[PDB]
């Protein structure tokens, strides 16, 4: 299942055996709520009724403007996360366009409405207060329960300038969301995947407050499309590889900057430089293509042979040999340099390995924690097999007198080109 | 209204036609809540009463210490976001200083109190529980409704170490906030602007828990002053401009780093390097001067002539010709390089343009989405006119043999100085 | 108590007199909730009962997977913030392991349970709904109050993919938390420190939803261990030090990059490059060692003598002489360059100092605000003594013709090595 290799030569590690679920597109749905325009038992409902009016009044000043959004991570492009959503929203403001929906959801709560600009959208009426108020109201406990949802949606939108994420159970109750997934124009694989991970789907969704007109409240829910499912993913962990000379400051370092999540995708490889745009559930990785780069499948060759002629593996250089650790999926990389105390420990047994200077690695099998300096790291105790791939630390292949000691957006070939240049001049 | 130019020569775009609203100062207000010190129907109120006591008790251990706060974005200074607020808070701890406020808000809920260090502050009593408990309490539903606000403010402060933002309707109800804006010593223009955008104002405000002494709870609300309104703003979007040679890795790139929000301000131009410190509502940009740089109005000359002699336009260089896109206000910039598939599409019609290698641009007029590699971007469908300004890609003016391929905090003149130096040596 | 020195020579300032509280380890505790498996007065409880069932049902699809987590800040390592917690969680899934806890908390609510892998954990039953429902239920107001907590924990976990922080009073009520701290295997110093700062402890804790099996709900609370208390801490503030020549762009700059929080720790000094991983309460600094570097105590020598031979003080260079300010603990650093207007002001008196070009500093004593360009900074009005340490701005010691104008990850010796190299070639 989940496995991991460590490369002693490049001070990196790859965790493989993951299955993609990349948000690729968006599905927009219009959620609605129909509204009403209007002793001791009475006075308490008069208070609960003004709560209603206040919520509505508050939702109205909220919509005096169209809703807002305006290592190698810096290489990414720039999106408009909710452009699709808002695009749908601006259409609901058109006259009659509201009345089509008010009409469509008359005998049912869940209908598909074709809109005037050709977007076919799944509409949903999740709360009919008009029906409740105009009849049942025109018991103090009954009303408070029905009204409470309305007020809470109002709180979320008011403190979020009218765009919320993750999408809450107020915006879309669990049962409403699951059923919304079912009636959705997608595959049986997406339907199951989404349904088995509704808490994730929520995190990847947007609730955009839209309009209050003609006794109707509308807000667009922006839901993820996972066009890429069950393709291989692997996570690349890198740590700094430095020399270990005695005199501190005479050392040269080197770090692979191409770390992140990597997934096979449509011939190429989707690269996620910020591995917090990805959420791992067991062996499934949920990613967002908005936060990715599209690289050749040859990018994977840097792992095994960082000197390969097919892809120019990206690194960075420095003379800053500080100690740290990276806690991988199935173990720990340790960069021990200078006078730092770095160890690995078991729970009850205590210290079971003292790391020598340079980049080393230990697997979580038998290890519970890792210490580098004053920093205690707990390792992930997830089940899986590690493979330590012994090799000569490539930092040893460079002569320190002609080693460029402050490159960030660099690569193996760019370093050799700067060495070849400085070598010539000598 | 909103318009946009694309510069084919510098691979950038400027969206103009926006109106400033920059937070420049802060207004502090002291919000108060007066407190009380003390079968089946009874037992439920005994539970609701201990909820009260627990909230108070919790608010008390919370205040055993003074409240806490201690591309070109890295160039910004560093503020103390709530220094003004806390400055006011430390004054309320002085003896008698509480009793002045308890006194002032005796016959009214909204009074201005001059404090001992010369700060004149608008005080506000938004909930008189003392009055309710000592009289009405010393019905089970009535008490729960009145008490509930107190508990919720207590939740917000307890999970936020006593400083909340955005400011909630619990901290300051909509009606309380609007009326607080009205009695505020500001212009008619600020009052209207603030009131039309209370959800934004909330996002730009702070609620700082302050003190519980002498039957009084106090917390300072820190509200934005918009000293700059209705001055021109424009947003600069940049993308990487690379050469497009066949052999991958023989290409040189170049990106304008001076991207962000730009606003006219008091002779100079306020620059916002992190365009997420700015919130756009329709055509109004709300910004924070805390997150800005003060640049000459001559900074705008980089757009039209990046080679102008009046301002040294800031760029960065690399050899990393990866493909991406930037979704502008009224369109999309596309940096297509190497073997990447980049297209633009309409909704129902499909693909309507295939981008060739190099930096190009397309407007949202007729386009719904843009694709660069495995990444689908939706364009903003906001209404407005785009202008494509044809020009020769300046990256072509540089000889690759003497082009500095890893500059970040650089400029046009710094690159020429490094070229002039390396040229001489040859 | 709290004091501060400014170094005119290096354009930096150090605020000293703080007391450490560094999270070093984690304490895991298993919180439980025991569950039940099953006219006008009746119908409302039938609604409150399905709320129960819905919450439970929702908590169940939430746990179809193991919970998720997968200037000089870039030098830090990488942790697995909740690895310890999840490590404990995966154990509760083992058969019988639940039934041990269900058993242990039969006659009490707070017991220590040894688990099958040798971890001794403090278990806690904070809500016995099984007892309430199977007896009292098998009044409409009573049930709603008891049930409400359950629903709210369910909301927190559902919108957070099952991992929450800060830990709320729903997850662990104030009284439950304090008492959990008391029965904890730690010192009298940690117990008092933790208890006096429960709002902070909450911010530094994790609530990880774990399991629903055998009428039991379990979630692990991950609580901080403060192994380092009451050791000296100091905060280093740096600002750019540039020359002040007339012709703009002929100036060279220099900034100390080693800014952050610094604390004495076990022979070495814990360095916190991102001073927002640290929370200051009065004179106590709460830090996380996960976000730190372990440096020699000789790092403090850069303050007084940045040219000292014991530690290679870290700086960065540029030619970007933009004006800004840094608001220190007891004052303000001002970097005024070019045509910028920089001043310092009192509240009622107005402007009391106009800053000349170059890096200067003013103390909060008598000053309320500082202005640099269009940016108004309020200074922290915290009480304490400042010391201005006059010295020659070291940027004057460098010849601009051979000054490396774009170094980031550099140091005093690396700059001299690049100068010595370029000097030789001339
Ligand atoms: C210059 C500068 C200013 C601010 C930041 C971010 C501040 C952290 O919050 C950074 N990034 C962190 C960071 C950490 C180590 C870095 N090392 C470098 N290389 C120095 C560039 C100069 N080159 C050319 C001249 O001769 C010396 C080497 N850069 C510059 C650099 N940086 C990026 C992201 C892309 C391309 C690039 O050449 C670094 C940036 C860099």
PDB file of N, CA, C and O in Angstrom, chain A residues 238-291:
ATOM      1  N   UNK A 238      11.963  17.052   1.023  1.00  0.00           N
ATOM      2  CA  UNK A 238      13.387  17.364   0.915  1.00  0.00           C
ATOM      3  C   UNK A 238      13.885  18.080   2.164  1.00  0.00           C
ATOM      4  O   UNK A 238      13.110  18.743   2.847  1.00  0.00           O
ATOM      5  N   UNK A 239      15.179  17.935   2.449  1.00  0.00           N
ATOM      6  CA  UNK A 239      15.845  18.596   3.575  1.00  0.00           C
ATOM      7  C   UNK A 239      17.232  19.058   3.121  1.00  0.00           C
ATOM      8  O   UNK A 239      17.744  18.569   2.113  1.00  0.00           O
ATOM      9  N   UNK A 240      17.844  20.009   3.842  1.00  0.00           N
ATOM     10  CA  UNK A 240      19.119  20.527   3.332  1.00  0.00           C
ATOM     11  C   UNK A 240      20.298  19.563   3.448  1.00  0.00           C
ATOM     12  O   UNK A 240      20.520  18.958   4.498  1.00  0.00           O
ATOM     13  N   UNK A 241      21.055  19.444   2.364  1.00  0.00           N
ATOM     14  CA  UNK A 241      22.208  18.564   2.320  1.00  0.00           C
ATOM     15  C   UNK A 241      23.467  19.413   2.357  1.00  0.00           C
ATOM     16  O   UNK A 241      23.789  20.110   1.392  1.00  0.00           O
ATOM     17  N   UNK A 242      24.173  19.376   3.481  1.00  0.00           N
ATOM     18  CA  UNK A 242      25.349  20.221   3.653  1.00  0.00           C
ATOM     19  C   UNK A 242      26.579  19.369   3.882  1.00  0.00           C
ATOM     20  O   UNK A 242      26.473  18.193   4.226  1.00  0.00           O
ATOM     21  N   UNK A 243      27.750  19.959   3.684  1.00  0.00           N
ATOM     22  CA  UNK A 243      28.970  19.276   4.057  1.00  0.00           C
ATOM     23  C   UNK A 243      29.090  19.408   5.566  1.00  0.00           C
ATOM     24  O   UNK A 243      28.331  20.145   6.198  1.00  0.00           O
ATOM     25  N   UNK A 244      30.042  18.685   6.143  1.00  0.00           N
ATOM     26  CA  UNK A 244      30.111  18.564   7.588  1.00  0.00           C
ATOM     27  C   UNK A 244      31.511  18.869   8.127  1.00  0.00           C
ATOM     28  O   UNK A 244      31.957  18.236   9.081  1.00  0.00           O
ATOM     29  N   UNK A 245      32.192  19.836   7.511  1.00  0.00           N
ATOM     30  CA  UNK A 245      33.537  20.219   7.935  1.00  0.00           C
ATOM     31  C   UNK A 245      33.543  20.767   9.352  1.00  0.00           C
ATOM     32  O   UNK A 245      32.515  21.232   9.856  1.00  0.00           O
ATOM     33  N   UNK A 246      34.713  20.712   9.983  1.00  0.00           N
ATOM     34  CA  UNK A 246      34.874  21.110  11.376  1.00  0.00           C
ATOM     35  C   UNK A 246      34.660  22.611  11.584  1.00  0.00           C
ATOM     36  O   UNK A 246      33.801  23.015  12.370  1.00  0.00           O
ATOM     37  N   UNK A 247      35.432  23.435  10.879  1.00  0.00           N
ATOM     38  CA  UNK A 247      35.285  24.886  10.983  1.00  0.00           C
ATOM     39  C   UNK A 247      33.918  25.334  10.474  1.00  0.00           C
ATOM     40  O   UNK A 247      33.622  25.237   9.285  1.00  0.00           O
ATOM     41  N   UNK A 248      33.085  25.818  11.390  1.00  0.00           N
ATOM     42  CA  UNK A 248      31.729  26.240  11.058  1.00  0.00           C
ATOM     43  C   UNK A 248      31.748  27.461  10.149  1.00  0.00           C
ATOM     44  O   UNK A 248      32.403  28.454  10.450  1.00  0.00           O
ATOM     45  N   UNK A 249      31.029  27.373   9.033  1.00  0.00           N
ATOM     46  CA  UNK A 249      30.993  28.445   8.055  1.00  0.00           C
ATOM     47  C   UNK A 249      31.812  28.148   6.812  1.00  0.00           C
ATOM     48  O   UNK A 249      31.748  28.881   5.828  1.00  0.00           O
ATOM     49  N   UNK A 250      32.592  27.072   6.856  1.00  0.00           N
ATOM     50  CA  UNK A 250      33.361  26.639   5.695  1.00  0.00           C
ATOM     51  C   UNK A 250      32.588  25.581   4.921  1.00  0.00           C
ATOM     52  O   UNK A 250      33.099  24.994   3.969  1.00  0.00           O
ATOM     53  N   UNK A 251      31.353  25.349   5.347  1.00  0.00           N
ATOM     54  CA  UNK A 251      30.493  24.340   4.746  1.00  0.00           C
ATOM     55  C   UNK A 251      29.567  24.874   3.666  1.00  0.00           C
ATOM     56  O   UNK A 251      29.055  25.992   3.772  1.00  0.00           O
ATOM     57  N   UNK A 252      29.335  24.055   2.646  1.00  0.00           N
ATOM     58  CA  UNK A 252      28.395  24.401   1.592  1.00  0.00           C
ATOM     59  C   UNK A 252      27.158  23.494   1.631  1.00  0.00           C
ATOM     60  O   UNK A 252      27.252  22.310   1.956  1.00  0.00           O
ATOM     61  N   UNK A 253      25.996  24.055   1.316  1.00  0.00           N
ATOM     62  CA  UNK A 253      24.761  23.292   1.406  1.00  0.00           C
ATOM     63  C   UNK A 253      24.021  23.273   0.096  1.00  0.00           C
ATOM     64  O   UNK A 253      24.403  23.938  -0.863  1.00  0.00           O
ATOM     65  N   UNK A 254      22.919  22.540   0.093  1.00  0.00           N
ATOM     66  CA  UNK A 254      22.189  22.240  -1.121  1.00  0.00           C
ATOM     67  C   UNK A 254      20.851  21.608  -0.751  1.00  0.00           C
ATOM     68  O   UNK A 254      20.821  20.612  -0.022  1.00  0.00           O
ATOM     69  N   UNK A 255      19.753  22.176  -1.246  1.00  0.00           N
ATOM     70  CA  UNK A 255      18.431  21.617  -0.983  1.00  0.00           C
ATOM     71  C   UNK A 255      17.598  21.502  -2.239  1.00  0.00           C
ATOM     72  O   UNK A 255      17.471  22.471  -2.977  1.00  0.00           O
ATOM     73  N   UNK A 256      17.025  20.325  -2.481  1.00  0.00           N
ATOM     74  CA  UNK A 256      16.063  20.152  -3.567  1.00  0.00           C
ATOM     75  C   UNK A 256      14.785  20.935  -3.283  1.00  0.00           C
ATOM     76  O   UNK A 256      14.099  20.653  -2.307  1.00  0.00           O
ATOM     77  N   UNK A 257      14.462  21.899  -4.146  1.00  0.00           N
ATOM     78  CA  UNK A 257      13.326  22.793  -3.931  1.00  0.00           C
ATOM     79  C   UNK A 257      12.032  22.252  -4.508  1.00  0.00           C
ATOM     80  O   UNK A 257      10.956  22.803  -4.254  1.00  0.00           O
ATOM     81  N   UNK A 258      12.135  21.168  -5.274  1.00  0.00           N
ATOM     82  CA  UNK A 258      10.977  20.619  -5.980  1.00  0.00           C
ATOM     83  C   UNK A 258      10.092  19.755  -5.080  1.00  0.00           C
ATOM     84  O   UNK A 258       9.428  18.837  -5.556  1.00  0.00           O
ATOM     85  N   UNK A 259      10.052  20.068  -3.789  1.00  0.00           N
ATOM     86  CA  UNK A 259       9.217  19.311  -2.865  1.00  0.00           C
ATOM     87  C   UNK A 259       7.761  19.743  -2.933  1.00  0.00           C
ATOM     88  O   UNK A 259       7.450  20.875  -3.328  1.00  0.00           O
ATOM     89  N   UNK A 260       6.874  18.831  -2.540  1.00  0.00           N
ATOM     90  CA  UNK A 260       5.442  19.030  -2.688  1.00  0.00           C
ATOM     91  C   UNK A 260       4.701  17.737  -2.989  1.00  0.00           C
ATOM     92  O   UNK A 260       5.264  16.641  -2.875  1.00  0.00           O
ATOM     93  N   UNK A 261       3.427  17.856  -3.352  1.00  0.00           N
ATOM     94  CA  UNK A 261       2.661  16.696  -3.794  1.00  0.00           C
ATOM     95  C   UNK A 261       2.743  16.574  -5.305  1.00  0.00           C
ATOM     96  O   UNK A 261       2.724  17.569  -6.022  1.00  0.00           O
ATOM     97  N   UNK A 262       2.852  15.345  -5.784  1.00  0.00           N
ATOM     98  CA  UNK A 262       2.962  15.096  -7.209  1.00  0.00           C
ATOM     99  C   UNK A 262       1.900  14.106  -7.610  1.00  0.00           C
ATOM    100  O   UNK A 262       1.776  13.054  -6.986  1.00  0.00           O
ATOM    101  N   UNK A 263       1.120  14.427  -8.635  1.00  0.00           N
ATOM    102  CA  UNK A 263       0.139  13.463  -9.110  1.00  0.00           C
ATOM    103  C   UNK A 263       0.142  13.319 -10.612  1.00  0.00           C
ATOM    104  O   UNK A 263       0.291  14.301 -11.339  1.00  0.00           O
ATOM    105  N   UNK A 264       0.007  12.074 -11.062  1.00  0.00           N
ATOM    106  CA  UNK A 264      -0.153  11.776 -12.474  1.00  0.00           C
ATOM    107  C   UNK A 264      -1.463  12.371 -12.964  1.00  0.00           C
ATOM    108  O   UNK A 264      -2.496  12.225 -12.317  1.00  0.00           O
ATOM    109  N   UNK A 265      -1.417  13.056 -14.097  1.00  0.00           N
ATOM    110  CA  UNK A 265      -2.595  13.742 -14.594  1.00  0.00           C
ATOM    111  C   UNK A 265      -2.503  14.018 -16.095  1.00  0.00           C
ATOM    112  O   UNK A 265      -1.748  14.889 -16.529  1.00  0.00           O
ATOM    113  N   UNK A 266      -3.262  13.253 -16.874  1.00  0.00           N
ATOM    114  CA  UNK A 266      -3.477  13.538 -18.294  1.00  0.00           C
ATOM    115  C   UNK A 266      -2.198  13.663 -19.125  1.00  0.00           C
ATOM    116  O   UNK A 266      -2.078  14.551 -19.967  1.00  0.00           O
ATOM    117  N   UNK A 267      -1.250  12.767 -18.892  1.00  0.00           N
ATOM    118  CA  UNK A 267      -0.014  12.770 -19.649  1.00  0.00           C
ATOM    119  C   UNK A 267       1.102  13.452 -18.890  1.00  0.00           C
ATOM    120  O   UNK A 267       2.270  13.081 -19.009  1.00  0.00           O
ATOM    121  N   UNK A 268       0.742  14.455 -18.103  1.00  0.00           N
ATOM    122  CA  UNK A 268       1.737  15.230 -17.387  1.00  0.00           C
ATOM    123  C   UNK A 268       1.693  14.890 -15.908  1.00  0.00           C
ATOM    124  O   UNK A 268       1.049  13.929 -15.500  1.00  0.00           O
ATOM    125  N   UNK A 269       2.387  15.677 -15.104  1.00  0.00           N
ATOM    126  CA  UNK A 269       2.314  15.496 -13.671  1.00  0.00           C
ATOM    127  C   UNK A 269       1.911  16.804 -13.015  1.00  0.00           C
ATOM    128  O   UNK A 269       2.581  17.816 -13.168  1.00  0.00           O
ATOM    129  N   UNK A 270       0.796  16.784 -12.304  1.00  0.00           N
ATOM    130  CA  UNK A 270       0.420  17.931 -11.505  1.00  0.00           C
ATOM    131  C   UNK A 270       1.315  18.039 -10.274  1.00  0.00           C
ATOM    132  O   UNK A 270       1.421  17.097  -9.485  1.00  0.00           O
ATOM    133  N   UNK A 271       1.962  19.194 -10.125  1.00  0.00           N
ATOM    134  CA  UNK A 271       2.842  19.468  -8.997  1.00  0.00           C
ATOM    135  C   UNK A 271       2.222  20.488  -8.047  1.00  0.00           C
ATOM    136  O   UNK A 271       1.786  21.552  -8.465  1.00  0.00           O
ATOM    137  N   UNK A 272       2.200  20.153  -6.762  1.00  0.00           N
ATOM    138  CA  UNK A 272       1.634  21.025  -5.734  1.00  0.00           C
ATOM    139  C   UNK A 272       2.718  21.480  -4.762  1.00  0.00           C
ATOM    140  O   UNK A 272       3.030  20.772  -3.803  1.00  0.00           O
ATOM    141  N   UNK A 273       3.297  22.667  -5.018  1.00  0.00           N
ATOM    142  CA  UNK A 273       4.438  23.209  -4.276  1.00  0.00           C
ATOM    143  C   UNK A 273       4.124  23.496  -2.815  1.00  0.00           C
ATOM    144  O   UNK A 273       5.021  23.462  -1.968  1.00  0.00           O
ATOM    145  N   UNK A 274       2.859  23.764  -2.525  1.00  0.00           N
ATOM    146  CA  UNK A 274       2.415  24.014  -1.168  1.00  0.00           C
ATOM    147  C   UNK A 274       1.557  22.859  -0.685  1.00  0.00           C
ATOM    148  O   UNK A 274       0.349  22.857  -0.884  1.00  0.00           O
ATOM    149  N   UNK A 275       2.183  21.879  -0.040  1.00  0.00           N
ATOM    150  CA  UNK A 275       1.523  20.623   0.331  1.00  0.00           C
ATOM    151  C   UNK A 275       0.505  20.785   1.468  1.00  0.00           C
ATOM    152  O   UNK A 275       0.293  19.867   2.266  1.00  0.00           O
ATOM    153  N   UNK A 276      -0.122  21.957   1.528  1.00  0.00           N
ATOM    154  CA  UNK A 276      -1.213  22.229   2.453  1.00  0.00           C
ATOM    155  C   UNK A 276      -2.438  22.644   1.638  1.00  0.00           C
ATOM    156  O   UNK A 276      -3.493  22.961   2.182  1.00  0.00           O
ATOM    157  N   UNK A 277      -2.269  22.641   0.319  1.00  0.00           N
ATOM    158  CA  UNK A 277      -3.379  22.729  -0.615  1.00  0.00           C
ATOM    159  C   UNK A 277      -3.930  21.328  -0.871  1.00  0.00           C
ATOM    160  O   UNK A 277      -4.936  21.158  -1.564  1.00  0.00           O
ATOM    161  N   UNK A 278      -3.244  20.332  -0.310  1.00  0.00           N
ATOM    162  CA  UNK A 278      -3.634  18.928  -0.419  1.00  0.00           C
ATOM    163  C   UNK A 278      -4.026  18.355   0.944  1.00  0.00           C
ATOM    164  O   UNK A 278      -3.346  18.588   1.938  1.00  0.00           O
ATOM    165  N   UNK A 279      -5.130  17.618   0.987  1.00  0.00           N
ATOM    166  CA  UNK A 279      -5.618  17.026   2.228  1.00  0.00           C
ATOM    167  C   UNK A 279      -5.637  15.515   2.088  1.00  0.00           C
ATOM    168  O   UNK A 279      -6.338  14.976   1.238  1.00  0.00           O
ATOM    169  N   UNK A 280      -4.865  14.823   2.914  1.00  0.00           N
ATOM    170  CA  UNK A 280      -4.804  13.369   2.825  1.00  0.00           C
ATOM    171  C   UNK A 280      -5.816  12.688   3.732  1.00  0.00           C
ATOM    172  O   UNK A 280      -5.823  12.928   4.940  1.00  0.00           O
ATOM    173  N   UNK A 281      -6.665  11.846   3.141  1.00  0.00           N
ATOM    174  CA  UNK A 281      -7.570  10.968   3.888  1.00  0.00           C
ATOM    175  C   UNK A 281      -7.194   9.516   3.610  1.00  0.00           C
ATOM    176  O   UNK A 281      -7.476   9.007   2.528  1.00  0.00           O
ATOM    177  N   UNK A 282      -6.561   8.863   4.585  1.00  0.00           N
ATOM    178  CA  UNK A 282      -6.051   7.490   4.448  1.00  0.00           C
ATOM    179  C   UNK A 282      -5.000   7.376   3.338  1.00  0.00           C
ATOM    180  O   UNK A 282      -3.820   7.614   3.585  1.00  0.00           O
ATOM    181  N   UNK A 283      -5.412   7.007   2.127  1.00  0.00           N
ATOM    182  CA  UNK A 283      -4.470   6.937   1.008  1.00  0.00           C
ATOM    183  C   UNK A 283      -4.945   7.766  -0.191  1.00  0.00           C
ATOM    184  O   UNK A 283      -4.368   7.711  -1.282  1.00  0.00           O
ATOM    185  N   UNK A 284      -5.999   8.542   0.036  1.00  0.00           N
ATOM    186  CA  UNK A 284      -6.551   9.440  -0.967  1.00  0.00           C
ATOM    187  C   UNK A 284      -6.066  10.866  -0.736  1.00  0.00           C
ATOM    188  O   UNK A 284      -6.159  11.390   0.366  1.00  0.00           O
ATOM    189  N   UNK A 285      -5.544  11.496  -1.777  1.00  0.00           N
ATOM    190  CA  UNK A 285      -5.102  12.879  -1.676  1.00  0.00           C
ATOM    191  C   UNK A 285      -6.084  13.772  -2.388  1.00  0.00           C
ATOM    192  O   UNK A 285      -6.296  13.623  -3.581  1.00  0.00           O
ATOM    193  N   UNK A 286      -6.688  14.700  -1.665  1.00  0.00           N
ATOM    194  CA  UNK A 286      -7.518  15.706  -2.313  1.00  0.00           C
ATOM    195  C   UNK A 286      -6.708  16.959  -2.614  1.00  0.00           C
ATOM    196  O   UNK A 286      -6.159  17.580  -1.714  1.00  0.00           O
ATOM    197  N   UNK A 287      -6.635  17.335  -3.881  1.00  0.00           N
ATOM    198  CA  UNK A 287      -5.835  18.490  -4.262  1.00  0.00           C
ATOM    199  C   UNK A 287      -6.636  19.496  -5.070  1.00  0.00           C
ATOM    200  O   UNK A 287      -7.730  19.196  -5.546  1.00  0.00           O
ATOM    201  N   UNK A 288      -6.089  20.695  -5.216  1.00  0.00           N
ATOM    202  CA  UNK A 288      -6.732  21.709  -6.031  1.00  0.00           C
ATOM    203  C   UNK A 288      -5.796  22.099  -7.159  1.00  0.00           C
ATOM    204  O   UNK A 288      -4.660  22.499  -6.914  1.00  0.00           O
ATOM    205  N   UNK A 289      -6.264  21.984  -8.396  1.00  0.00           N
ATOM    206  CA  UNK A 289      -5.398  22.246  -9.537  1.00  0.00           C
ATOM    207  C   UNK A 289      -5.124  23.737  -9.672  1.00  0.00           C
ATOM    208  O   UNK A 289      -4.189  24.140 -10.366  1.00  0.00           O
ATOM    209  N   UNK A 290      -5.920  24.550  -8.984  1.00  0.00           N
ATOM    210  CA  UNK A 290      -5.692  25.986  -8.962  1.00  0.00           C
ATOM    211  C   UNK A 290      -4.332  26.318  -8.373  1.00  0.00           C
ATOM    212  O   UNK A 290      -3.764  27.356  -8.683  1.00  0.00           O
ATOM    213  N   UNK A 291      -3.818  25.428  -7.530  1.00  0.00           N
ATOM    214  CA  UNK A 291      -2.574  25.661  -6.804  1.00  0.00           C
ATOM    215  C   UNK A 291      -1.458  24.736  -7.264  1.00  0.00           C
ATOM    216  O   UNK A 291      -0.664  24.246  -6.451  1.00  0.00           O
TER     217      UNK A 291
END
